[PDB]
Write a protein that binds this ligand. Structure first.
Ligand SMILES: NC(=O)c1ccc[n+]([C@@H]2O[C@H](COP(=O)([O-])OP(=O)(O)OC[C@H]3O[C@@H](n4cnc5c(N)ncnc54)[C@H](O)[C@@H]3O)[C@@H](O)[C@H]2O)c1
Ligand SMILES: NC(=O)c1ccc[n+]([C@@H]2O[C@H](COP(=O)([O-])OP(=O)(O)OC[C@H]3O[C@@H](n4cnc5c(N)ncnc54)[C@H](O)[C@@H]3O)[C@@H](O)[C@H]2O)c1
Ligand SMILES: N=C(N)NCCCCN
Ligand SMILES: N=C(N)NCCCCN
Lengths: 474, 475
């Protein structure tokens, strides 16, 4: 039967019961030992409440806010007898403030995004840079500098951000092995960064193609997605953002850097979900992705930075999302940006509605001797239904990553604030892999200059096909 | 019963029997008197042959080419008795050369595009300007100057180009009434141009939203459309192109003009089907369209040009396509441009496959005192099936326009080379309207600056909402 990894000796407080919470609950019940009454779900939605009642779990129908979060969460997380676990799978709540609360009270914490309190993503008084994921991530890095060590809190441990950091490590090890490079694999951050440098990895796309589709066609004036519509639209309206490689020799006129922080990012003064990049996955082959901002774009580039003695970066890979969502989501974006406003309604595709498809999600390492290598999951909806309830393929990649991060945090409970890049990738993938379907590594000779230039003048760099100059659709 | 407008006494030579030929043949049989044996269909495909054989129509399985077109077509066009009609609904053939051949042999001619001989659209040695529809159209204008008058040949008389020119005239008449502009209805080009100027029409979108969809979802690595995939892709890869208004204050850095010709156009050094514009239709409300080059973008702007005594244009509207095709075609474009190459396969959706939807096709006149006015057809697939066989709603708007053009040509057979802008719009719409479903005019307060600027700095002109600077989507 299914492995039971650990006993949780305290309350399990799940904040949010949308597509991810719904997928994560059965894995928590499956894989951890605890008295049933220890677990409670918090979400303001009526739809969520009804589902939770049907699953027999405690449910508190309340929005967690800046005004109530201490009065609500401190008692729930300290109910006893021992260490609890805050599993934060929400929108509209501050990941930073909830994480700090959990740590102050000795509760473990995990989330899948650095989310702000409601009001931030569309605050008109905020400059674009202040709305960036780089800025949000810097709040977490500052919190870690202020309070090193202490109770483990795992930031951004879903599928992407999350699992894809483990895929980057596995891909680096595979690339070295395929080149005939043997020996002890890296154990420190500096060793990982040097491995990427040494192998000549110029950059990395988080290269995703979701082919799930429903039994009904996309409705007019309805945004359709396979996971959070609210969350996808919010990140899609944030600036396009990327980890910025030392090899890059060009950026657009509307690109900007940061005066402070880890140093690894740029952003563009335009929305990421209306920015296209040329990319590739095994099933899609050459495709457009959307350059939607994501925590891992910054965290992976930061993690893989090599500095000189003076502290200047001498190597860092480019890293960004290149997302091709499901076809109905592609149409939803065309509709939303074309109208200039959010649709009147939205819906997240349920497994009962999906006729076929996969969520092909991996990392595309490029610029090395073998040109490009994609490593990741090809999980299908059919396999998903066989192995986990209450979710589609997109959901299961995320919920299984939360499971893996929870196992890691319980196993390493005194590690302080950590990102997915800081965890034991082998252990996390050992836990996650039963839920990932085919996990494969594929080389390709494709580059962003394939077939170019065409019949119009193009500003390309033929000396270096993987330059962002050639990737960005301009 | 259906009106039989005229007898056709000579050969009816249909070149091409794809989606539009299949929709047009039944209308020709319905609306003209003639012995069926006088019809001949020419198409290289086996698919077309079997369909033509099923209709008991004479078929020649040949590609018309620069090498064979004279030897092949002249005996067909001149078989008699009396005047033939060449109905050209093909791809890969020279509209100009075939039209000139028809005229020199006294046969009427109609087409729906200025198509070049196979090889042109992807010729790597062609300068971008030479790939433009402005350039192709100038070959037709030059032919007209060289041989004025004579046998009628109707260039670009489908739905768009074609019908939409008639919608522009009707829309101008309606705007004049609604804005209180008095005067007799224009009866000359110069008078139409002056009316557009007096009404303050800054520009015109050919504003289209196709909502047809099939019983199956879009297959991977298949381009899906409701009409010619080959044709749509070819025009989509031509430069983005537009008739250029005198009111415009800005053009992109990669815009270019023309040193010669009618003077009405610019083009952009990028493909039109990967160029977006902000536009609007009644059912879509605000939407993106693709800035795909079309003959009418140039022909309507040219027709509505006012010149001073020196010959300099003092007024001309902007005019261009703002096309939102069916959802499966939107996905097909994302796939094609994302991969950098044509899909391995394609299909045109048949009426038997389409579950619901309309082809909402009209003209959006903007900049006047009531902001913007859309006039056009909202034909549904359900209505299409009730009234005409072998086609979807896209096809029927086109085939019925060809029908209207044929009736006009038979009634005016010595008018020389003409575009849809030159035809009697009322007579043409009288013939076509039974096939157009709801034809409506709708005002809107929407403008391209609605909701802007938003969260990011935008390069907009806040002084004039309808400036191209505000319409063009700038990656
Ligand atoms: N790292 C990844 O791979 C990844 C993947 C998917 C989702 N996510 C993120 O996970 C989160 C959940 O995604 P989802 O698909 O479940 O979204 P969802 O939109 O389906 O559900 C969000 C849920 O949060 C709720 N909620 C709203 N306000 C709340 C509040 N004040 N307090 C508590 N709950 C509140 C909704 O009622 C709701 O049910 C999103 O933030 C998201 O961006 C991360
Ligand atoms: N003005 C408008 O509104 C409008 C609308 C639709 C189509 N069109 C145009 O009409 C034409 C036909 O469109 P469609 O949807 O029927 O296209 P289609 O792709 O369905 O059919 C084209 C047909 O031409 C044929 N053909 C190819 N090479 C030929 C040759 N050398 N000689 C003769 N025939 C040849 C194919 O075998 C074929 O059946 C296209 O050029 C097009 O762009 C205009
Ligand atoms: N992952 C990084 N960018 N730095 C390492 C952080 C180490 C936290 N203990
Ligand atoms: N329609 C124009 N642009 N000019 C008028 C041409 C008239 C041809 N008889």
């Amino acid at each position: 039967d299914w492995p039971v990894y650990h006993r949780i000796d305290g309350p399990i407080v799940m904040i949010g019961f949308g597509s991810i919470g719904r997928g994560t609950l059965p894995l928590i019940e499956r894989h951890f030992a605890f008295d049933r009454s220890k677990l409670v779900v918090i979400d303001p939605s009526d739809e969520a409440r009804k589902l939770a009642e049907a699953r027999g779990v405690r449910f508190i129908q309340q929005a967690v806010t800046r005004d109530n979060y201490r009065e609500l969460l401190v008692p729930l997380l300290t109910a006893g007898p021992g260490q609890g676990f805050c599993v934060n799978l929400s929108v509209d709540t501050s990941s930073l403030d909830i994480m700090e609360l959990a740590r102050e009270n000795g509760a473990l914490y995990i989330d899948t995004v650095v989310e702000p309190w409601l009001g931030f993503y569309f605050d008109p008084d905020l400059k674009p840079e202040a709305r960036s994921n780089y800025a949000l991530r810097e709040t977490v890095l500052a919190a870690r500098r202020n309070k090193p060590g202490g109770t483990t809190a795992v930031s951004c441990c879903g599928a992407n951000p999350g699992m894809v950091s483990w895929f980057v490590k596995q891909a680096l090890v595979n690339l070295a092995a395929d080149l005939g490079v043997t020996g002890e694999e890296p154990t420190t951050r500096e060793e990982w960064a040097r491995l990427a440098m040494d192998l000549g990895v110029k950059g990395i796309h988080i290269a995703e193609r979701d082919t799930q589709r429903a039994s009904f066609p996309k409705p007019f004036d309805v945004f359709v997605n396979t996971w959070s519509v609210e969350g996808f639209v919010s990140q899609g309206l944030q600036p396009a953002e990327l980890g910025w490689g030392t090899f890059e020799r060009w950026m657009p006129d509307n690109a900007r850097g940061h005066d402070s922080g880890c140093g690894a990012g740029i952003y563009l003064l335009q929305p990421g979900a209306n920015t296209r990049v040329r990319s590739w996955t095994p099933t899609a082959m050459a495709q457009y992705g959307f350059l939607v901002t994501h925590n891992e774009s910054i965290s992976i580039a930061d993690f893989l930075t090599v500095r000189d003695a003076a502290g200047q970066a001498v190597y860092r890979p480019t890293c960004h999302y290149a997302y091709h969502p499901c076809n109905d989501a592609v149409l939803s974006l065309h509709e939303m940006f074309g109208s200039g406003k959010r649709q009147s309604d939205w819906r997240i595709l349920d497994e009962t509605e999906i006729v076929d498809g996969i969520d092909e999600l991996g990392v595309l390492l490029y610029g090395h001797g073998k040109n490009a290598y994609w490593y990741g999951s090809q999980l299908s909806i059919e396999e998903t239904r066989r192995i986990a309830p209450d979710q589609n393929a997109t959901g299961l990649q995320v919920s299984s990553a939360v499971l893996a991060g929870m196992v890691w945090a319980l196993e390493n409970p005194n590690a302080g604030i950590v990102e997915a890049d800081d965890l034991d990738f082998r252990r996390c993938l050992e836990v996650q892999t039963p839920y990932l379907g085919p996990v494969v590594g594929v080389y390709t000779d494709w580059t962003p200059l394939a077939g170019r230039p065409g019949l119009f003048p193009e500003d390309i760099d033929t000396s270096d096909p993987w330059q962002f100059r050639n990737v960005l659709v301009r």
